[PDB]
Structure 1
């Protein structure tokens, strides 16, 4: 199935504070009214020019995402894992399976089998928009956790994704997949495009509206 975004994926290009102005910018912005691939809980999707990821769920089913070129060994692969504890980011040559997921006792973790050449290692309803972007080896993640009143459906409204983590690792991301929690006891994929956006700000610095 396919769905129509309305005004979604409009993150702050970056920081500096701006009061009520109409600063027109030009960055990788999901074009207004785009065709978001409605997925349901998955196959490997291309990364191309950045990935928009709206997740409409209450219980944690989206348990992180894998990223990389060949998504395996020989080439490094950025794994972002999310468990009952916290987030584990790791760029190593892994051995991702054809179906990389985790079970739910709570016996989980089937994603990969190997973890060689580990360069980077980090350890620590509700609509969760995510914007991924690897410009110049900088994996700038953007996030918007806006609680919805639906279940797994894309709502109508505006959201300014606030910049989250930036990984200066330098890994070729040409493909990506989604790690999901299976049962032992729906997301949306969009692609950002170079788009000129008249960003209307607020006195508190918030992108309240855009054109």
Structure 2
């Protein structure tokens, strides 16, 4: 979105656990939008909502996995004529917990996944994560370029 509050429309693209849903609605967002216990704690309300459908049916659980980092999931988001184009590729990347933080070497091409007709001005974005039942963040990392 642009201001990420209830005077403008915002795009809500996320995985609820069984599906990938995109919602372009006017969200009264929480001060920190975050999943708590595989339950949405993202917005208080959403009224003027122009787009609401599921993009894909993938089974992503909310279970903590012990050990080191296993995979890297890379995304490219770009706006082209009012549509949000998503490019995606996932690669096996074994990175230790206390190791030096760096991106993998080589080239992994990202395939075009979706073209979402949001029809919005996008100047800012925020990341949605999930915590444990006691609202404690998990072991993860994300990169923005």
Q: Return the TM-score normalized by structure 1.
A: 0.54
**Equivalent residue for 1:142?**
87
Higher RCO, 1 vs 2 (CA within 8 Å, ≥6 residues apart) = 1
Q: Which residue is 1:188 aligned to?
A: 143
In structure 1, C-alpha distance between the alignment counterparts of 2:19 and 2:126, rounded to whole Å? 19
Q: Counterpart of 1:88?
A: 21
Alpha-carbon distance, 1:151 to partner: 4.4
Task: Give the number of the structure whose residues are more often strand, by fraction.
Answer: 1
1:1-211 to structure 2, matched below 5 A, reads: 68-104=1-37, 106=38, 108-123=39-54, 124=57, 125-151=70-96, 153=101, 154-184=103-133, 186-190=141-145
| Contiguous gaps of at least 5 residues in structure 2 | 58-69, 135-140
Displacement after TM superposition at 1:87 (Å): 1.1
State the alpha-carbon separation in 2 of the partners of residues 72 and 80 from structure 1: 16
Q: Deviations over 1:91-121 (max 9, x none)?
A: 00001111100112x4x21110111111010
2:111 and 2:22 map into 1 onto residues whose CA distance is 20
RMSD of the TM alignment (CA)?
1.5
Deviations 1:124-160 (A, max 9, x none): 5111010001122011111111121224742111111
SS at match of 1:117: coil
Aligned length: 121
Cα shift readout 1:46-105 (whole Å, capped 9, x = no counterpart):
xxxxxxxxxxxxxxxxxxxxxx0111222110001212222111000001111100112x
- Indicate if the aligned counterparts of 2:11 and 2:118 stay in contact, CA closer than 8 A: no
d(CA) in 2 for partners of 1:121 and 1:75?
A: 17
